[PDB]
Amino acid sequence: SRLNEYQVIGRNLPTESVPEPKLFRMRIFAPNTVVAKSRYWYFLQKLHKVKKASGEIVSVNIISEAKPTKVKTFGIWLRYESRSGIHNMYKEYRDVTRVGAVETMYQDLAARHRARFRSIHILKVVELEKTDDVKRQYVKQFLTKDLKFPLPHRVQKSKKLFQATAPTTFY
Amino acid sequence: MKYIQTDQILDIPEGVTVDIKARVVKVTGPRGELTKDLKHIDVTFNKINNRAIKITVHNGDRKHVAALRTVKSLIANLITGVTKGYKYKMRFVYAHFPINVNIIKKDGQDYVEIRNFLGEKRVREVKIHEGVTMEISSTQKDELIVSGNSLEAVSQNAADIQQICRVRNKDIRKFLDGIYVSERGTIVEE
Amino acid sequence: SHRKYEAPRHGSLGFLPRKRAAKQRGRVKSFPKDVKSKPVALTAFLGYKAGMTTIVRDLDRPGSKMHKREVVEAATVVDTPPMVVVGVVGYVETPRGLRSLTTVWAEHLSEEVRRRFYKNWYKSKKKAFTKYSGKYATDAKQVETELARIKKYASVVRVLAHTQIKKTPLSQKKAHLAEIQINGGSVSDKVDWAKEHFEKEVSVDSVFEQDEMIDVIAVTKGHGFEGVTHRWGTKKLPRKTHRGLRKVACIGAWHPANVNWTVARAGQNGYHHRTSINHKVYRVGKGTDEA
Amino acid sequence: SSTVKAANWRFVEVGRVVLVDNKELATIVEIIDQKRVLIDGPKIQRQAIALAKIVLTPIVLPNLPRGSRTATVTKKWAAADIDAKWAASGWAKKLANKERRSQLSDFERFQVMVLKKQRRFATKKALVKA
Amino acid sequence: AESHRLYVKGKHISYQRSKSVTNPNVSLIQIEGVASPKDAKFYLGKRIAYVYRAPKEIRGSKIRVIWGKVTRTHGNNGLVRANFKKNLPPKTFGASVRIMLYPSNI
Amino acid sequence: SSFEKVVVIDGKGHLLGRLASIVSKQILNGQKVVVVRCEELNISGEFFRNKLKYHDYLRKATRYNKKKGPFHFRAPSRILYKAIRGMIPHKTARGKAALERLKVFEGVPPPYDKKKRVVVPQALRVLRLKPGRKYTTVGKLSSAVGWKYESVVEKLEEKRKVQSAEYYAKKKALTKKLNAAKASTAESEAAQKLAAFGY
RNA sequence: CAUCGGUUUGGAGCGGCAGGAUAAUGGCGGAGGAAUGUGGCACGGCUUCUGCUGUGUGUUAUAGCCUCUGACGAUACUGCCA
RNA sequence: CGAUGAUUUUUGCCCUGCACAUUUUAGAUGGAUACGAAUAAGACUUUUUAGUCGCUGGACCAUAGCAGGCUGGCAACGGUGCGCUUAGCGGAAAGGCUUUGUGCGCUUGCCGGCGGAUAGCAAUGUCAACAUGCGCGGGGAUAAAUCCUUUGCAUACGACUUAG
């Protein structure tokens, strides 16, 4: 989707036995706060004896990128369901925002594994600080010194249906 | 994976002048000139110096990268064809019936005429490609020498001669008769 | 269900439709391919079927049981008086096929060929080719201009020739006029050859030699409306079949719910255009020879 | 010699001046992917953009380090005087002439026609004798 | 003086329609040189004339007109919806109309 | 975007179906279209694949009478015409008129050899196909299935290009002379004012 | 044609206000650090050292970058304007 | 779909210069404005090293004058329309593209004088190419086919091959 990173905090409803239950935080990549709070309860019931009916959302906050114009490399740890089983995988993405790497991930597993949004768990998104942290060659090839490349065969978009001159692709 | 860039380096010997313009390679050497069109491939060329040429593929996938070292090898074969030549030697293999091979000329064209192959009355004729020289070896009994500047033409004439002498309706493990390429080298020994 | 037993189809689907020829004069569908290195020569001739005869001949075919031995063979006589050249046509290569560019005629045409252009000759003023005959007035530059156009643009040159049917015993007075392609030499050579032969006779001995293999173009014998039994050679039905037996019993399955084009049906038999090839020339006789 | 004809492409490199929206200049400061770059300029917002949305110009801002911040890019842009180099090219001149033509009024178009008539008279007079 | 045109060239393209049902009360018009809804919004409210020839003369003239006006844009490529006093006959699909420069708001 | 009296399209290097759809919408909307050089059109996919497709097309014929069935035209212009006609409601009077607005040719016959041929960028093979893909030339596909006049068209196309080259050399020479005359009248009062107006 | 009333679709619309990490950035200042190490230095292959260049070293020099942070100043986004 | 022959002695037919009036239009309303080829390439200059052009036709040509009137001058010896006229090229469906001389106009290249109203505040406010007919004028040419009789290379009848 078009996503945002949210900080969602929730807890079990206080009881006279437990008047200050533990506060649990999750980082959720969701298009809006309605899905952000929905995804939160989805993962807490995978981890704790809690429900939306027996729990309480305490805080929902957008987490903005720290340096949105600094180019980073992200490692994303995934747990997705295929047609046959459940698999763990790790992939890497280059982007300037943490959210935009997760958006690329969702497009990428849709394209390479036919994995829908419902079939994916994001275990962890980590910015790889060191160039030695980069394991995948499809993003390591852009970390070489003095990187240059042309864009051969440029196709120019025309406003008109008919053109009176021969087409060209220089660039 | 779309490799960002892949490179190969041609090496040009001292007397050879490669010449590339719009993926049309013209290699000139002491032995003559050879030309090759590579318009079916998306490659670019950079002259590093008079002894090296860079061959590059930009943002190429696995197969388009695979087509790069073959471009290098084809141009290298052109280079070694105009400076050393190519020589394929064929040996005549027969158990009973001697194979009578002659270099004949009919209608102004050179032909290799194979007779008596496995005793057959049929006369096999193989057209000799342009730029390719056939010779019956004097130093060796039952040997044909296929030589020329173009490796592709030389090897294809050798293959024509070998393929026209195939055995039919027999156990070819037993009936091993034929004309086979025994040595693939160069005219100028190194 | 399949046929109980197999049998080949009756008749050829390559000679459909079995209709009457559009004309009685057989037309050369294809001429011999032109070779420039050869001399300029005609590729066809028109004659009249006289009759059949018998010859005796010594066979020269080694390995045959009739080798060096006399054979008795059927032969056909074709009456072929010399044809007269009266015109020339130029053809142009186009992306839609050959196209005739210009037709140049001779100055004088005989009456037998001018009757070709009439349905009622006896009631006519016989005005054909009179203004064209006037085109030759004292310089004939119109004719030379058309001939130059043919030389400049034509790739295929055909001559126009007619038979001298008055030399045959036929009571018909119309000559038969046909286009005969000229092969050999350049286009200019062909046009010069055609012009120099205007109003001249061309004999068979200048077109065909003895021992040649030639083709025959003709319209076959007409038989009128014919039933399937003789038109297509189908099997006669049993003697005890109701409503007759010279039929095809099943003219189709239930589906396709139509009669197919491949089923034998009654219709017109004979009078078809045929091209028959590889007829050997045993004799090119001469009319002046008394033997 | 060898005489190899080489491509005269424009490269995606740190220091390339690009047009954005066919109006404004920017420079590439760092490459993200085959498809995306980070661009910056004095009169544009530092942003991650796709190379399809921009056009590489024949101008390179020399000696621009990878990942340079806005202050460094602005200082080096002013030093190299990229704006003047752009404004001196036929590309920028054609863009400017297109804008100027688009701002003409009906009266100015009439004057253009009249002056064109005069210049055509002079041009034909010169052409017939040469 | 070789040109005297004061209207923009147009074409009667279609009726308003779904896949199978057409609505003759709305015509789809292509204004020449217009390729976007932003360009086509200049022409909203302008009067359209379909000029045609007829067998009978009316007051010495064989030229008749059906008048209309541009009401709204259509789609993304600069076609407009038009509303004529009498519906344009279906035979005019592909026929040229005149997009008038009035009511002017320049 | 202008309405033209006739749009003459040079069909060389154009993808068959994309050009067909664009031309179909053009002629439906009342525009006269001429497509020349239909033997230089392109279909995506290797030659063998498109030849197999045409043989699938040839398989189809009316069983009870072959003369009623589909008529498989072999000429490149007729292949383009079939592609276009499949995109037209050709069984109505309006579709029939729209098809009357169209002409397709092999080569560039008169009078179009001395007219302006345009291209259609949305249907150009060099601009549409990924640079590694294989394509077919309709002229080669037509010859492989029965078209007889390939060598006639190329002989006539070489003659036309020789004549068209003489045209261009003459036109280029007069452009050079006119440019030299416009250079002489530069920096004149009329020229300076026209430069301030953008001309 | 004008103006009105009802309904409705728009504009590259314009302005004011509020919220958020009282946006995150960026710019300016301070402190620390590293490399896809700038200058320099030491060895080299081609250069009359003509973006010459490669490999080492180390930490701003004849480029810069990253992290933390201090006082300001904006913008995005989402709402509100009777 | 092409080439070619002949096309009514009738007041009928053909070609052509006008003049007028009509029917029709799948839809004029300044101009269909002509290299070829590649596209991981094109084109300029030096030098084959390098620099420059494109990044769309929002271009080019044409465009002022009662739908464009009537007159005058200046500057140039150009531009353009029409009519004769010279020569050449074009056969893919050429039916078009050039070109010589000449004559009559116009010229907005520049500067003048006179005219337009009232169609009333819009009403397509009527201006085109193709065709046909009809009047004149100038030239030009002067047929066949079918039925019928006949034939039998044909044939159910039509049709076909012949002859008259």
Residues whose CB falls within 8 Å of the CB of residue B29, separated by 6 or more in sequence, listed in order: B13, B15, B16, B17, B79, B81, B82, B83
Q: CA nearest C96 in F: which residue?
A: F149
Distance separating alpha carbons of residues D28 and D32, to the nearest angstrom? 10
Residue C169 is classified by DSSP as: S
Distance of CA E30 to the CA centre of its chain: 8
Q: What span, in angstroms and rounded, lies between the C-alpha atoms of B57 and B66? A: 10
Residue E95 sits at the chain F interface (C-beta within 8 Å): yes
Q: Which long-range contacts (CB under 8 A, 24 or more apart) does C187-194 make?
A: C187/C150, C187/C151, C187/C154, C187/C155, C187/C157, C188/C151, C189/C40, C190/C40, C190/C157, C191/C88, C191/C90, C191/C147, C191/C150, C191/C151, C191/C154, C191/C157, C193/C40, C194/C85, C194/C88, C194/C157, C194/C159
Tokens of F100: 């009357």
Q: Does C contact D via 3+ CB–CB distances below 8 Å?
A: no
Those residues of chain F whose CB sits closer than 8 Å to some CB in chain A are 1, 7, 9, 22, 26, 116, 118-122, 124, 126-127, 131
Show the tokens assigned to B87.
């020589």
CA distance A114 to A132: 30
Neighbours of chain A (3+ CB pairs under 8 A): B, D, F
Please tell me the distance from the alpha carbon of residue C127 to that of residue A69, in angstroms, as a whole number: 99
Q: Hey, which residues does A86 pair with through a beta bridge? A: A81
Residues 206-235/C with CB within 7 Å of nucleic chain H are: 221-225
Place of tokens 């360009």: E39
* Statement: the CB of B5 is under 7 Å from strand H: no
CA distance A125 to A100: 11
Q: At what angle do helices D106-128 and F150-184 cross, to 10 degrees?
A: 100
Integer-rounded Cα Rg, in Å, for chain E is 14
Candidate from D97, D119, D130 with C-beta closest to F198:
D97
Residue contacts between E and F (CB atoms, under 8 Å): 25
Integer Cα distance of A102 and A29 in angstroms: 8
List of E residues 50-89 with CB within 7 A of strand H: 51-53, 55, 59-61, 63, 65, 67
**Cβ contact A77:A87 at 8 Å:** no
Nearest CB partner across the interface for A163, out of F26, F119, F131:
F119
Query: Which DSSP string do the residues of B63-104 spell out, in sequence order?
Result: HHHHHHHHHHHHHHHHHHHTTT-EEEEEEEE-SSSPPEEEEE
Question: Closest approach of chain F CAs to the CA of D95, in angstroms?
Answer: 11
Q: Closest CB to E13: pick one of F1, F2, F29.
A: F29
Nucleotides on chain H that have an atom closer than 7 A to a protein CB are: 1-7, 23-43, 48-60, 62-65, 67-68, 76-79, 90-97, 108-110, 123-128, 142-147, 153-156, 160-164
Nucleotide with minimal C1' distance from the CA of A129 is: G66
**Residues forming a β-bridge with B111:** B104, B127
Closest-approach residue (CA) in chain B for D4: B20
Q: Which residue is nearest to nucleotide H124 (CA to C1')?
A: E51
| Identity of the residue numbered C122 | Y
Chain B residues close to D3, C-beta within 8 Å: 17, 19-21, 47
Q: Would you put residue D40 in left (φ > 0), alpha (ψ -120 to 50) or beta?
A: beta
Q: Which residues contact F53 (CB under 8 A, 6 or more apart)?
A: none
Closest by CA to B1, choosing from A138, F35, A141, is: A138
Nearest CA in chain F to E78: F1
Please report the beta strands in chain D, taking only residues with DSSP state E, as ranges in sequence order. 11-12, 16-20, 24-31, 36-41, 44-50, 54-60
Do the beta carbons of residue D67 and residue D29 sit within 8 Å? yes
- Beta-strand runs (E) in A41-170: 55-62, 72-81, 86-95, 120-127, 149-150
Q: What is the H or E stretch that residue C195 is in?
A: helix C187-196
Residue B133 C-alpha, separation from nearest chain D C-alpha, in angstroms? 29
Positions of strand G less than 7 angstroms from a protein CB: 1-2, 9-12, 20-21, 23-28, 35-37, 46, 51, 54, 63-68
Between A and B, how many CB-CB pairs are < 8 A? 15
Q: What does chain E look like in DSSP terms, one character per residue? A: ------EEEEEEEEEEE-SS-EEEEEEEEEETT--SHHHHGGGTT-EEEEEEEEEEEETTEEEEEEEEEEEEEETTTTEEEEEESSPPPGGGTT-EEEEE--S---
Interchain contact, F28 vs E33, CB within 8 Å: no
The whole-angstrom separation of Cα C161 and Cα C113 is 9
F127/chain D closest Cα distance in angstroms = 15
Total residue length of chain D: 130
Per the CB < 8 Å rule, is F149 touching C259?
no
Pairing between β-strand E61-74 and β-strand F42-44 as defined by DSSP bridges: unpaired
Residues 15-54 of D with CB under 8 A from B: 34
CB atoms within 10 A of CB B171: 8
Q: Is D108 exposed, middle or buried (0-12, 13-18, 19+ CB in 10 A)?
A: middle
CA distances from B97 to B145, B175, D80, F128 (A): 21, 11, 85, 61
CA distances from F125 to A95, F16, F26, F49, F130 (A): 34, 9, 20, 17, 9
| Chain A residues touching residue B5 (CB < 8 angstroms) | 149
Helices then strands, counting H and E runs in chain B, come out as 2, 12
Q: Are F80 and F11 in contact (CB under 8 A)?
A: yes
Candidates E65, E69, E24, E28; CA nearest to E46 is E69
Q: How far is the CA of B148 from the CAs of B34, B155, F148, in angstroms?
A: 11, 10, 39
Q: Which chains touch E (3 or more CB pairs under 8 A)?
A: F
> In angstroms, rounded to a whole number, what is the distance separating the alpha carbons of residues C81 and F87?
61
Check if B180 contacts D (Cβ < 8 Å).
no
B118: left (phi over 0), alpha (psi -120 to 50) or beta: left
Query: At CA A125, angle to CA A124 and CA A131, rounded to 5?
Result: 125
> What residues of chain D lie within 8 A of the CB of F199, using their CB?
101, 112, 115-116
Is strand H in 7 Å reach of the CB of C169? no
Interface residues on B facing A, Cβ-Cβ cutoff 8 A: 1-5, 42, 44, 58-59
> What is the SS3 assignment for B40?
coil
Q: Which residue of C91, C260, C265 is the best one to mutate when testing the F interface, meaning the one whose CB has the most F CBs within 10 A? A: C260
Place of tokens 């923009």: E8
Any D CB within 8 A of F197 CB: yes
Chain F CB contacts of D107 below 8 Å: none
D8 DSSP 8-state letter: -
Q: Minimal CA–CA distance to C146: which of C103, C180, C182, C188?
A: C103
Please count the residues of chain C: 291
Could you tell me the two tokens for C165?
A: 């049917």
Residues D77 and D88: their CA atoms lie apart, in Å, by 16
Residue B18 in contact with partner chain D when CB distance is under 8 A: yes
Q: What are phi and psi of C72, to 5 degrees?
A: -105, 125
Q: Are E1 and E94 in contact (CB under 8 A)?
A: no
Deposited resolution, Å: 2.8
Greatest Cα-to-Cα distance within chain B, rounded to the nearest angstrom: 61
Nucleic strand H contacts from chain F, 121-160, CB < 7 Å: 121, 126, 131, 153, 156-157, 159-160
Distance from CA of F30 to the nearest CA of E (A): 4
Cα of E49 to nearest chain F Cα, Å: 18
Put simply, the answer to whether A162 touches F118 (Cβ < 8 Å) is yes
- Contact: F190, D111; criterion CB under 8 Å: no
Q: F69-108 b/e with 16+ CB inside 10 Å = b? A: eeebebbbbbbbbbbbbebbeeeeeebeebbebbebbbbb
SS3 C34: coil
Residue C127 token pair: 């005005």
At C151, which helix (H) or strand (E)?
helix C141-153
Rounded distance, CA B15 to CA D17, Å? 43
Q: Do A161 and F26 touch (CB under 8 A)?
A: yes
Using only the alpha carbons of chain F, give its radius of gyration: 22
Q: Which nucleotide is nearest to E47 (CA to C1')?
A: H122
